[PDB]
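Hi team,

As requested, here is the filled-out complex form for the magnesium ion run. I kept the field names the same as last time so the parser does not choke. Let me know if anything looks off before we queue the next batch.

— J.
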Amino acid sequence: RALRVLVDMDGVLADFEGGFLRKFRARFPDQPFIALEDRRGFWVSEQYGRLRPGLSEKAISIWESKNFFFELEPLPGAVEAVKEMASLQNTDVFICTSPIKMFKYCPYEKYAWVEKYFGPDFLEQIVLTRDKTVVSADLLIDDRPDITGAEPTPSWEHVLFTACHNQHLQLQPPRRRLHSWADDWKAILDSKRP
Amino acid sequence: RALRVLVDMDGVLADFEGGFLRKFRARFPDQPFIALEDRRGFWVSEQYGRLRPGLSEKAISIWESKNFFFELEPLPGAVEAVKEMASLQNTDVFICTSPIKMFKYCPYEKYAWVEKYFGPDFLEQIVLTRDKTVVSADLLIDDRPDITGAEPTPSWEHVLFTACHNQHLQLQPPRRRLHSWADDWKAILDSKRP
Ligand SMILES: [Mg+2]
Ligand SMILES: [Mg+2]
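And here is what came back:
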């Protein structure tokens, strides 16, 4: 009966791409980098790996460092939109996020970041998982173009959240986008209601 | 097509009740305690709270301490059973576990514990969530008697794993139990296959 919406964290609530570039440039000032406008493909480390040998490992070292996830800044409008979305009648919102492989800091900092921007009671809405296809819901708003896993037919409709790395992608017709949190997310939710 | 099975962590893979009692007695040797045979009800802190004022907070302080989750011992047969279950054809296993409210150590230690007993590649099968009803699967093996959340009609069948706190419970007829990992878990899985 309640519409269930899963909202991604990196690239949707938290500005992973800008935080990464800033810290990469500060730590490795003598290395070439990729301006956000020139980002292509989901995996940051793969594109850095193509720009020069050893750069993929240096890029990885930035998000594996302590405080990287905790210090990410929210995207404009994200905190306000998700707070409003969660307060809507017949609407349950969960933050569904995938941790990186090195787990020393990332899970902990993601819970701390949600507590900081949404409060202690919102911690109950977090789902950490590498596989989002096994989480059931009506909608998944996520900036990754291809979301796959153990369930071949996920129950949610994936709405692609725009990001520097996917903004030029042409999607297969059925597929929809949410361009930013300033875009009309309520209309998307309502199109899925009974 | 593959059968999907969710396996709980505390009380099913990891011996939370015995680890808790041991550490509680070592830290608070002058306080009364609850022998496992006398445990009743899911929430440990509630029963300790009834045995003497201030004991609920002392009990909580044990599982909120660093290394409590990481040092839990596996239940007999659990690691071997889940490793065999995951290697079965047409069978996907996920560890679905709910962290406690204080998140400084628990999520991190649960990933570290899975890495220790199942290896780095199994970290991909972990789902951390307070709400297991939004995870879809064919079966959920979990020692908690009443598992509820945002989805009123979960897709999985909940098989109750026996624990000191639920061993005397009479379940409503349809409901099934797995008595220990020595019990016949393969027969349970097979009863759900096509
Ligand atoms: Mg993302
Ligand atoms: Mg349990």
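Two things worth flagging: The first strand of chain B starts at residue 3 and ends at 7. Chain B has two domains: 1-15+71-194, 16-70.

Thanks,
J.
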